[PDB]
């Protein structure tokens, strides 16, 4: 069917071109409406605006003095560039496909119809905060357990900003798995720690390693845990 | 077409009262006598009494007498103008006053007694 | 956006009333979205649903006019919690820009889960890096609201500790970490540390040593 | 003076206006608010003012008077008497061969009508054209059909009637607001009905001028609204019916047409300058079933 | 708009109300008062009004036509 992701900088300084993409897969880019939508936290949902199979532009008029949303169909990529961010426009951009409806309550002759609009498949979103504080990486710190079952797992510290995302033995470990989330220490730093159930028999040995990603630092750690 | 649409049901208690309204349409509300029949399970109709919408003049009946007050509210704009309201009034509540009050109309303005239209019954649980 | 709350018990049903009623022929959406997640369209025209909705979410349509648009919720569960919007187009009112208010569906009665402690330690390379962390863990509790309290030896401590707001798991419970910085002096210093997670009624004692 | 604005939509027909009218205390003033059809305003310079204050009074329709067309019978009086005529073939003038007698006439429908003659009465056999003299094209051709083409109008929109007091007694009832959509009134014709209708009309028009010349059918070419549309009332209203697509046919040798209605409430009637009438709006959605039954056409150098 | 007191006593029936009148000329008012009983005002929350105005129009009795019930007789036409 038709699957999206976003990709965007998850960092633009204030005052700064918020630049954006999303990519669809197995789906036509010329062929349906596309909408893009911002969710911050404490505010409900924002409709940016929407593109059209014609490449149409109507964005909302809350925005319209700053968005400019594009489109290139040489790939099944579009794109997304507000401008003059603020602390107010840090969101989860989700990438959807819009759906044109046509509400007839009438005479079609006499316009007597209006047109509405529908998501039905949505992208993952892609988290962007705006903040003059530069980016920064993690360092992550081993947790070993301590002898049937226990638990074991990888302390991410200081890091900036929102999110990681963790992995173990590069994918193939994924049952009992548990990633929490973070917390936003008064220093202004992330830290997040994960944690894996693992059977006692494995203690001695079957190899962990945690995969540690933090994008906007370009950073890609691992480490071992053992008692 | 003549209907009469009353007022919805209502639980009271021993001591208070209530009232209750029948809105007619269809035919001149002067002319035509109005009844108020209340109709409890295990018991005779019983006939409150009549009130003509010509000045209001009504007729309680016996063992309602001082507990009963019967009134009229006719619109005064020519337009829909073939509408009144009887309002009844039962003060003092008794469990015995439990039953569902009707309000009839007879069949020609000339005779009253014999009711052929009736409004849908007000429900009253004491 | 404001948030309009609403409760229901574990297995009855729903009834989400629009709070943007329509003024002529209405198209309206509804959707579906979670906290920090991807929403989900649940009716896209005012009765119609996409593939892969159970039945039980309807959506009301207008062959009448009067009859307002709600969305009704048969045999809720407890992952039925989330936020509910009224995407409303008639055509009356203009091009509907804004989604709808903000249904919060909170499922009362649900089953009461007792936490789970996990306290670890501080690492070698971080001591060896001239820092200490305590992580206690705390996972599969329900309702997810509960009192963080760590001590040294026997002592409160307050100073320097950070927790998290117990966010919602994938198994309807909730989980929270909590964090205790410590110098790599003060962690040695002492004899033994206690993370008393109090949880609704009683408390779980988690405690760590340095051997 | 009238303080109006569009009714909320998107074209902008029917204005939202306010205005301070009197009371029943004669030193208390209200800001109450009414729709108006463009028709029955017009601006000053935004600003707008009732159609007819420039010109006439105005006397509101009192909202218990009857506009349906009732049967009406003339009768002559003693001593007198009024012949009929049976003749089938009948055209306006000459002698009738088959003359009756009768007390009074048949049951005539006053419907005022415009350009197309509603719920009148058929003709037997064949469809007649009449006219005093067709030749002379300063003169309304009656054309009367002898089998009804059934036409469907409408008013779509569910209308509110709002009483004010503006007097000891004075109610002038106002249109509240639109409950549900806002439409557009038109009206339907079977196009089948029509073109077999507009078919005889043809037929019959050919003995007046000939087997080889051409007719062409258009609208109208210029005058008052009450001329140049189809204007008549439904359920209590009158609208005014854009003839065009009726009148659109070159003849020589499932379907539905529907006309685009618009709505008066200030209207004079007849054609006297003197007074203007307001006629209350009709609550609810109006719809009116009817037949057309005639026809006034009007021809325009040669042969077509 | 009608201001209305009582008339001086101690039961309080007839009233004593004054308005501000229309006159002769269109432009010019006046402050007249005059006694009405009290079933013929109703108030508005001392402010009263007469009775009919909300619901009808008034007619004033012309004072030279007779109200005295005189003895009528009711014939019936010829060839009754
Ligand atoms: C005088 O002359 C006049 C001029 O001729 C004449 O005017 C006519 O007036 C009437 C009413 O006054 C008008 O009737 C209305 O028609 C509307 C349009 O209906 C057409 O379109 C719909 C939708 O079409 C899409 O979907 C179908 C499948 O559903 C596809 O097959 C289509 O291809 C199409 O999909 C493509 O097109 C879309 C564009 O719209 C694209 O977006 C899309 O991506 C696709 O590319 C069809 O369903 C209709 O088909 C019906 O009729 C055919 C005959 O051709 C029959 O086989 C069968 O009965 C079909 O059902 C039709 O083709 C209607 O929307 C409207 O009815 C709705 O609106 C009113 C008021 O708003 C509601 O009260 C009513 O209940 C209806 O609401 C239902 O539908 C809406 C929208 O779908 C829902 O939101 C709502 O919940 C409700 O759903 C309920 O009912 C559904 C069934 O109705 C059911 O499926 C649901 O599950 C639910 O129970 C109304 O009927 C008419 O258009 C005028 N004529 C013209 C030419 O404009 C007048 O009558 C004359 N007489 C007078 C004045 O007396
Ligand atoms: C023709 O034009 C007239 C105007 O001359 C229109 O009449 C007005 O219509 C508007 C709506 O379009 C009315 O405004 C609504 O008033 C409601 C009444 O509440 C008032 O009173 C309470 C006290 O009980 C106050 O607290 C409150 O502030 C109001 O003063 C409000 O409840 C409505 O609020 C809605 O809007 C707000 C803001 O968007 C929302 O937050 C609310 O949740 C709610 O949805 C609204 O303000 C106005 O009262 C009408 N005026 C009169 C004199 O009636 C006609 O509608 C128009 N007709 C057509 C056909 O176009
Ligand atoms: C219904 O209500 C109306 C009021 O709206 C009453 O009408 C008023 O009645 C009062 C008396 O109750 C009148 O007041 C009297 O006015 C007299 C006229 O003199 C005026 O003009 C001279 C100039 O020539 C001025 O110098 C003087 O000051 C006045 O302005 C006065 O002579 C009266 O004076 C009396 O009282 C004073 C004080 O108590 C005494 O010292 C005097 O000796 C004297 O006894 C008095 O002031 C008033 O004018 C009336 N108004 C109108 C518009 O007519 C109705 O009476 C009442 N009806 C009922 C049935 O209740
Ligand atoms: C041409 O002639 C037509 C028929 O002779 C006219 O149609 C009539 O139009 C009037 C008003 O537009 C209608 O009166 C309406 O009555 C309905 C209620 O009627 C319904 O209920 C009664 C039961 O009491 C039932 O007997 C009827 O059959 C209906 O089912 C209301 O909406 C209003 O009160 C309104 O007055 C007539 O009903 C209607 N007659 C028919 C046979 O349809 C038409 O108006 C004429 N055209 C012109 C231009 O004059
Ligand atoms: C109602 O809507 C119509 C249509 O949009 C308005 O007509 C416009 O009037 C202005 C006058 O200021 C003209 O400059 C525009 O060219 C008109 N537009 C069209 C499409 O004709 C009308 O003004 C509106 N009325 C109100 C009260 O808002
Ligand atoms: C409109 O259509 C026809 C005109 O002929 C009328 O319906 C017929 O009326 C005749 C005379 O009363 C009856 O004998 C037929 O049985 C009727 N046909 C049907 C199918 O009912 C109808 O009354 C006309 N309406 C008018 C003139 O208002
Ligand atoms: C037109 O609108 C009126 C109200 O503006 C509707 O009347 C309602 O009818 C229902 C019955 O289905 C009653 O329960 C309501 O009490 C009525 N409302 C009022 C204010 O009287 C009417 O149904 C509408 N009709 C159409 C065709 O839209
Ligand atoms: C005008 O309206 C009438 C009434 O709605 C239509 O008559 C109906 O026609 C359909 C289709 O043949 C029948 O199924 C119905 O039984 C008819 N109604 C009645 C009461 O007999 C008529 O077709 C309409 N004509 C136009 C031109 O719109
Ligand atoms: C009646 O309808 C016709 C079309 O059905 C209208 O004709 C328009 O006339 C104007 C010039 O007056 C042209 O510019 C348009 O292109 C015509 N429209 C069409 C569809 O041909 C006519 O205007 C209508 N009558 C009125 C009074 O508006
Ligand atoms: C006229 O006199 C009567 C009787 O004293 C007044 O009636 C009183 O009205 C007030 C209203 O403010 C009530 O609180 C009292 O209880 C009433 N008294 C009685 C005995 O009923 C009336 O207000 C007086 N009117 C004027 C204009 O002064
Ligand atoms: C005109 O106003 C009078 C005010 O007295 C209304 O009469 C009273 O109305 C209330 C409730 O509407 C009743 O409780 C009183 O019993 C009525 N009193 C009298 C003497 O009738 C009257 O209803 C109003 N008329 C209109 C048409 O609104
Ligand atoms: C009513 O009169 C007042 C007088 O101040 C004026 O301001 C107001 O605009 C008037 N109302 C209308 C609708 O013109
Ligand atoms: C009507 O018929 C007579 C004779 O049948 C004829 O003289 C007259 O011209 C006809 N009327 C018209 C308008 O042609
Ligand atoms: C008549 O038709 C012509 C041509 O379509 C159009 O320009 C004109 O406006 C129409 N007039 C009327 C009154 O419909
Ligand atoms: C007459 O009008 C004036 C206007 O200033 C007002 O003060 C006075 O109270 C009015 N008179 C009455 C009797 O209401």
């Known amino acids: 069917q038709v699957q999206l992701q976003e990709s965007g900088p998850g960092l633009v300084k204030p005052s700064e071109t918020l630049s954006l993409t999303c990519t669809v897969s197995g789906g036509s880019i010329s062929n349906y409406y596309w909408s893009w939508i911002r969710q911050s936290p404490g505010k409900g949902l924002e409709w940016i605006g929407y593109?059209?199979?014609?490449?149409?532009?109507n964005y909302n008029p809350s925005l319209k003095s700053r968005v400019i949303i594009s489109v290139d169909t040489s790939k099944n990529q579009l794109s997304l560039k507000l401008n003059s961010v603020t602390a107010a426009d840090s969101a989860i951009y989700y990438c959807?496909?819009?759906?044109?409806?046509?509400?007839?309550?009438?005479?079609?002759?006499?316009?007597?119809?209006?047109?509405?609009?529908?998501?039905?498949?949505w992208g993952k979103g892609t988290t962007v905060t705006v903040s003059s504080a530069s980016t920064k990486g993690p360092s992550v710190f081993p947790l070993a357990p301590s002898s049937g079952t226990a638990a074991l797992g990888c302390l991410v510290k200081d890091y900036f900003p929102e999110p990681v995302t963790v992995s173990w033995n590069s994918g193939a470990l994924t049952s009992g798995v548990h990633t929490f989330p973070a917390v936003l220490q008064s220093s202004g730093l992330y830290s997040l720690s994960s944690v894996v159930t693992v059977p006692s028999s494995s203690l001695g040995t079957q190899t962990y390693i945690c995969n540690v990603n933090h994008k906007p630092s370009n950073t890609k750690v691992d480490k071992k845990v053992e008692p | 077409q003549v209907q009469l649409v009353q007022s919805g049901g209502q639980m009271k208690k021993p001591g208070e009262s209530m009232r209750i309204s029948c809105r007619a349409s269809g035919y001149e509300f002067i002319d035509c006598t109005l009844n108020w029949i209340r109709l409890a399970p295990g018991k005779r109709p019983e006939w409150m009494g009549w009130l003509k919408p010509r000045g209001g003049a009504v007729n309680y009946a016996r063992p309602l007498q001082g507990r009963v007050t019967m009134t009229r509210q006719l619109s005064q704009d020519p337009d829909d103008p073939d509408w009144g309201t009887a309002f009844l009034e039962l003060r003092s509540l008794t469990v015995d006053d439990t039953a569902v009050y009707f309000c009839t109309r007879g069949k020609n303005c000339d005779y009253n007694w014999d009711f052929e239209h009736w409004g849908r019954g007000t429900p009253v649980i004491v | 956006s404001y948030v309009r709350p609403l409760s229901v018990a574990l297995g009855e049903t729903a009834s989400i009333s629009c709070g943007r009623q329509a003024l002529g022929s209405r198209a309206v959406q509804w959707y579906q979205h979670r906290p920090g997640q991807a929403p989900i369209l649940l009716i896209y025209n005012n009765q119609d649903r996409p593939s892969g909705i159970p039945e039980r979410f309807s959506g009301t349509p207008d062959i009448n006019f009067g009859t307002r648009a709600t969305l009704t919720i048969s045999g809720v569960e407890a992952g039925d919690e989330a936020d509910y919007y009224c995407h409303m187009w008639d055509s009356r009112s203009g091009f509907s820009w804004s989604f709808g208010g903000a249904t919060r569906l909170t499922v009362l009665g649900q089953p009461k889960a007792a936490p789970s402690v996990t306290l670890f330690p501080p690492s070698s390379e971080e001591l060896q890096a001239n820092k200490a962390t305590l992580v206690c863990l705390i996972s599969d509790f329900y309702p997810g609201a509960v009192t963080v309290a760590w001590k040294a030896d026997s002592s409160p401590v307050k100073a320097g500790v950070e927790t998290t707001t117990p966010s919602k798991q994938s198994n309807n419970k909730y989980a929270a970490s909590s964090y205790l910085s410590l110098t790599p002096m003060q962690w040695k210093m002492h004899k033994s540390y206690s993370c008393q997670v109090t949880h609704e009624g009683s408390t779980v004692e988690k405690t760590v040593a340095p051997t | 003076t009238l303080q109006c604005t569009n009714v909320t939509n998107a074209r902008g027909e029917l204005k939202n206006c306010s205005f301070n009218m009197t009371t029943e205390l004669r030193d208390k003033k209200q800001k109450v608010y009414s729709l108006f059809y463009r028709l029955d305003v017009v601006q000053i310079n935004k600003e707008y003012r009732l159609i007819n204050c420039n010109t006439s009074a105005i006397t509101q329709a009192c909202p218990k008077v009857s506009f349906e067309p009732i049967p009406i019978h003339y009768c002559a009086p003693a001593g007198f008497a009024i012949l009929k005529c049976k003749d089938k073939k009948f055209n306006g003038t000459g002698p009738c061969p088959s003359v009756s007698t009768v007390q009074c006439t048949h049951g005539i429908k006053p419907v005022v009508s415009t350009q197309l003659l509603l719920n009148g009465s058929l003709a037997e056999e064949e469809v007649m054209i009449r006219s005093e003299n067709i030749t002379n094209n300063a003169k309304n051709i009656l054309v009367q059909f002898n089998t009804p083409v059934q036409i469907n109008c409408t008013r779509p929109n569910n209308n509110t009637r709002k009483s004010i007091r503006i007097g000891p007694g004075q109610a002038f009832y106002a249109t509240g607001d639109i409950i549900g959509d806002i439409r557009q009134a038109h009206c339907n014709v079977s196009k089948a009905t029509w073109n077999e209708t507009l078919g005889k009309v043809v037929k019959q028009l050919r003995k007046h001028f000939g087997n080889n010349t051409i007719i062409r059918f258009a609208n109208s070419s210029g005058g008052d609204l009450e001329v140049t549309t189809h204007s008549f009332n439904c359920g209590g209203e009158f609208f005014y019916c854009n003839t065009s697509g009726l009148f659109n046919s070159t003849w020589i040798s499932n379907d539905s047409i529907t006309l685009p209605c618009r709505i008066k409430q200030i209207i004079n009637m007849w054609q006297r300058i003197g007074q203007a009438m307001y006629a209350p709006p009709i609550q609810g959605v109006i719809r009116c079933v009817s037949n057309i039954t005639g026809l006034i056409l009007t021809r325009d150098n040669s042969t077509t | 708009t009608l201001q209305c007191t009582n008339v001086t006593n101690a039961r309080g029936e007839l009233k004593n109300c004054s308005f501000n009148m229309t006159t002769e000329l269109r432009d010019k008012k006046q402050k007249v008062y005059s006694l009405f009983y009290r079933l013929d005002v109703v108030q508005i929350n001392k402010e009263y009004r007469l009775i009919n105005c909300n619901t009808s129009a008034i007619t004033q009795a012309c004072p030279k036509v007779s109200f005295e019930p005189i003895p009528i007789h009711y014939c019936a036409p010829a060839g009754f």
């Open positions: 593109i059209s199979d014609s490449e149409s532009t």
């Open positions: 959807a496909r819009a759906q044109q409806g046509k509400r007839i309550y009438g005479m079609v002759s006499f316009g007597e119809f209006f047109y509405y609009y529908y998501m039905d498949v």
